[PDB]
Structures are given as structure tokens and as C-alpha cells.
Amino acid sequence: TTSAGESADPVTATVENYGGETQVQRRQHTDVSFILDRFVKVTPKDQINVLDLMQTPAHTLVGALLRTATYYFADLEVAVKHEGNLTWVPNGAPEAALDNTTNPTAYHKAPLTRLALPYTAPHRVLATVYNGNSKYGDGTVANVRGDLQVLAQKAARALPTSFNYGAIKATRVTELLYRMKRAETYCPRPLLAIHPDQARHKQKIVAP
């Protein structure tokens, strides 16, 4: 289909333009609420873990596919394998309130304890990248520093802990898993597949 090449309105030159017809297409597996509510592993610290969704890795499925959105809204439910007692704390409480048991602890029931948390952020919709990010500010005191203070790729790290779902604290968490349900996404961002060095990225597919 010949078009106006720069107006950037959507054009879909379908397969009927050179004979033929289109079939019924189903898109349930690419829905944004279906593809995001499954469990993903993140690395835990020893005791205190803020329940930020942007600490999911960038190589995994719903971490690299959550970063497709600029703005997201999703209720989080976690599943954590721990020992001791695990106290969840809402958004913006002091971190000394992790020790108190009036906050929603889960006693140890073997092997793991999954529990559904609400969206406790003050904002209408969370975010992934801030502009300008890391601005006390802009920038605390000096601070420098030396030689690697200028050329550094560590400025895309958020500072306000308001896009967090809260924090969990146990004696020693071993593996804590995120999933995000009722997920709404807004304003898409680019998604990258890895770069082939060959003619085509041939990997060993599964076979009998």
C-alpha cells in the first residue's frame, strides 16, 4: 500500500493486496494482564528487602517485559522461602517497624509462605525511570570522585522509595518470588532482543 511516508499514522498493507485472505487471529498469550502475573525469581539480601518491582533482572521474562512500560499499576503478591518470621511493612513506614510483630507477619509454615499485598504507593501509577533520576539534589555533597566519578553508568538508580510496595524482613530469606496481577501498563518503551553475530541467532532448541 502506497502511503504518505511521514505522517506516521498506522498503515497495514494486508495480504489481500496481492490475492488471498486473512485468518482469525487470537492474542490471549500476548495480553498484558496474562503475560505478567506469573512468578519470577529475584535475588534476595539476607534480611531486609524492599519490594520494588524494578529489582527484577533485565534478562528474565517479566522483568524485561515490565520495562516495556513507562507507567505501570499492578497488585503484588510475593512467595518467599525463609526461616524465622517474615514481617511485611507498608509503603513509607520507618524501617525500625520491621521488627514489630503487629505488622503482618507470616509464621513459618513449610516450605514457603505466599501472601497477597495491596498497592500501597501514594502515587496514582508507579514508574520505572525517573527524569531527572538521582537528584537529592541535584547530587549530595562532594563526593567526587577520584577518576571514575565522571564516567560511570550508575545514575539510572532511583532514590525515593515510594515506588515500592514495602519491605519484608526475616531472619534469613532464601528465595523470594514476585508476581504482579491486575497489571495495567501505559506508554510503551523499546524492548530488545540479543544481538546475533552470525547470519541468524541459532541456539540449541529442544529435541528428542
Binding site: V141, A142, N143, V144, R145, G146
Partner: protein, 590 residues
Amino acid sequence: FNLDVDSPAEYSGPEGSYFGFAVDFFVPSSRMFLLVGAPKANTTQPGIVEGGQVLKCDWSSTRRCQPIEFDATGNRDYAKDDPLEFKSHQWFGASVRSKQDKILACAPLYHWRTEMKQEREPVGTCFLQDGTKTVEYAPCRSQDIDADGQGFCQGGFSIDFTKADRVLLGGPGSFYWQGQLISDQVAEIVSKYDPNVYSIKYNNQLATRTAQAIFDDSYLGYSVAVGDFNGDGIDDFVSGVPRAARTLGMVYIYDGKNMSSLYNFTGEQMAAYFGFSVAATDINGDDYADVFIGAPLFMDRGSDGKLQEVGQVSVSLQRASGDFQTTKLNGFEVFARFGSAIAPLGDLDQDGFNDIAIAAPYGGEDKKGIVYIFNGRSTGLNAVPSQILEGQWAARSCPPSFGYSMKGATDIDKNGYPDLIVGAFGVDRAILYRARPVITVNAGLEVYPSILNQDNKTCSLPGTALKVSCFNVRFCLKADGKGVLPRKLNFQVELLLDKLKGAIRRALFLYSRSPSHSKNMTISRGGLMQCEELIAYLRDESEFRDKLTPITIFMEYRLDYRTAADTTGLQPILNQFTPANISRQAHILL
């Protein structure tokens, strides 16, 4: 001004080991022992070569240098299949400060990995020997790690001992090359250290933490000094900052009681290591320490326009409170770094004040080295030197720099005068210059009567029947000097008459009938003023011509260096600024 340059105590070491980078005295509190640390010598630990050791040279009887290593433990482990410490090429022997029986053999270039990641942080460690106990002191080895910690601290750079048994350590590379001076008593070192614990942390840890942003890369603690600088008796913790204020140089003198700043100084030339080598000692006479700041990389403003790297040492004098007077002491030869080998000498001649030795490493002929001696007086410190020294052996690839490691204020040859351990790491040679016994000689010439009549006619010339004018010459000799040396001083008294008369002399003796007389007068030291009186007459009237020139009697005596050796076999020397010859006059009326 009494260093034994003729036949000094030669000390050598292994090849390529830099024998003479850190030396110090040691006394088993008799006997004496020298401490010469070689940073690139062969070690007894398997798989580790050129690590470093502390060779103790025996000066008594025969020079017996013995390579000694305190904590000779191998590379420890922490996790699994990973050495916790890397003692390979650790340069063990960069700063070895001792005090009586304690031997502090520090090592700033001691590497140590992080307890959380496989790295290699040079944190430095010290090996202290308290009398007969072997302990390890390393304050820059605990929770602090690389970057925001004490990874590059290199604990054991600027070390010194006080009077209250407090070990003063100073690392310039602490916290992003800022610096930290940790001083801990020996009680916490011998009672608080544990070889099983890797995070050594003492209780009373008096030091300085991080500051603002302009203090970064300042080397806080490049040179340390002890003494009173505020009025409390306890030795303070002087800190040298070579990189202060756009690379100028400031000295931060901290208190040796609760860690508090006292006074601040100002450098002279930009980028000159204003505080590389300091020495706090009395020079004016008030029992107060006086820090003399060194400056190796100083360039004096010459008359030809182009600056010349000669170095500069500032002589500061402390009065009652803290009014330090700065006295600019320029260098000498070009490319000498006058201000690197500065060591107090103390009572070198027992003249009532202390002395100090400042040697130029890269200076001298053929880039060897000249040791400049600075003796004290009543006012302050002398500017001009008193004795010029030279090197002995040659070098290979590293520059010679004769005179780098040296100490003092400790008697070693057993006589009362401390020697000077001139240790040169470039030529791998440590030469010990012994202090010669300074003799305070007091001569005297009493020629009476003063006026001499031409027609006096008093005595009688033997052999003839013609009377002539005569006069009595009574010259006295006296010797007085502290130290262990034979009192029987064999002085060679040379009697000379009429120094002006080139022409025929008019004054001659009677017992010898010759103007020049030779006398061997061996007097005693510390006893009474042994004097001698003789008669000398004048020539006849029909011999001379001029009748207005006074008779200048010139006596020149020289101590015969023969039987003046005892025990150590060292030849004594006379006092400084004291000629061994005198001359008087005798008026002749007309």
C-alpha cells in the same frame, strides 16, 4: 662534625635487596644492635621471594648481620582456594622504628584481599617486638576496606614512638588517599591482638576520620614527629600534609592525648613535599621539641633566571606556647633533594644543646651523597655545614643516593656520643659513621712583659759577653672533654716566633738557638692546666732594622694520632670552630 669517615663500620647485604632503606638503633636493655631492613631480600617463606626482612647487624666485636623475620607466617586463607594475604614483593622494610627493646618493623606495601570479594588491597602491617614478645600491630586491617575505608591506607608508613609507650602509626593513603594517624599503646597490642581474628580493632583508637572534599589526595600523615607543642608533657602527634591547598604543603600538628589540632603551617613552593621528613628536637634550649620541616623538591630562585632543584629545610623554633619561628635553609647542589635524610643527633658533643644531621641523597659528586651536619648553639641552628661526607661503593641501575635512612639520639659505640647510621638503599649499603670524641682544648700564651725596650739588657747570652734584651714566654695548655678516651693527650707543640718576618726573623729562643722549635707535650684530660715557661731574647741592635713591628708569637700544636686509640680504636677530634694554633703580639717601644 666528628663522624669517622676514614674507617667507618661498613655494612652490606644481598644483591638487589636495597640494603639500607630503614635503619634504627637497638639496645638489649653493654651490647648494641643495628636494624637495617631490606625490602627486596630473600625470605624464609616458601614460594615468596624478594619480600623483605630485618637484618640485625652486630657491631660488638665483629660485624655480624643476621637476617631476622618476626611473624614469618605464610599466605593465610579465608574462603576456599584463595590466599587471604599476598606477601610476595611486600617490601617488608620500609619503616622500622625501634625504642629501647621494642622493634617496630612495619610494612606499608602489605596486600590483603577483601573479606567479601577477591581483590588485593595494600593495607600494610607491622611486626612489633616488645622486649622478648613477638606481636603484630596493624590498625588499618578491620571492617574498613577499599575505597570508602582503609584499603589503600598502607598502615605503617610514618611511625614514631612517644614517651608514654604509645605507638604512632600514619598512613597517607587512608580513605581516598587522604590519610589517618592511628596511635595505640603497646598494652592493647600485646593484650588485644589475636592471630585467629582477621578484623583487628583496638579500643582506644585515637585518629582522624574523613573530612570535606578539598582534603582528598592530601597524604595526611606523610611524616610524624613527637614532642611537646601545647604544654602538657605528653608527646604530640605531628602530621605532614604535602598535598595541601592546590599542592602547596601544610603541617597539621595533632595533640598526643585526645587527637586535636593545634597549629597549622604554610608551604613555600607549589609541589615540593612540604613535610616529607621532619625532626622534632630542642635547638634553642627550653626542653621543647622543634620540628624542622623538610622539602626535597624545592627550587630556589637563582640569579640566572632558571630555577635549580636544590631543596629547602625550614628550621622552626618553639618558644613557650606555640610560636614556631620559620628559618629558610636553602640547599646546595642541583638535583640533591636537601630534606630527605633528616635525623636528630642530640648531645653529639655535650655542648649544652642538641644537634641534627641532614644528608642530601641525590646530591654530591657522581650523584653519591653528602651528609650535612648541623650543630646547635645558644641562638638557634647553624646554616652553613660543618663536615662534608662522600660515598664508598658504586651503584647499578637504581641511583645511589648515599644517605637516606638514618636515626640518632641513642648511644651505640659506648662512649657518650651517638653515631650516625648512614643507610643507603640505592647502592644497597649501610655505612655507620662513628662519633669521634670531641676534645675541648684550651690553650694559652702569656708573653711578659708586653713592652720590649731595645736597650733593656736583662739576661745574658750564653757563649759571649754581650747582654741583650730578653722576655719571658709562658704558654699554658689545658684539655677538657667528655667521653671515654685516654686522657694522655700527646700534643705536638710547634713553637714559632715572628710570623711576619719572609725576611730574617728577629725573635729566637735561647735553649735551642732557633726560631722554630719542636716540643712534645703530653698533657692529661680533665686535670689541671699544664703550663710551660721559657725565656726568649731579642737579636742585637746591629742586626735588624725596623723598630716598630711587634713580635707576633705563633704557636701551632697538633694532637699526634697514635696512642689516642682505646677499646673501639677511634681517633678523637678537636672542638668545632676552635683553631689548634694561637698567636700574640709584643710591642717594642722606641
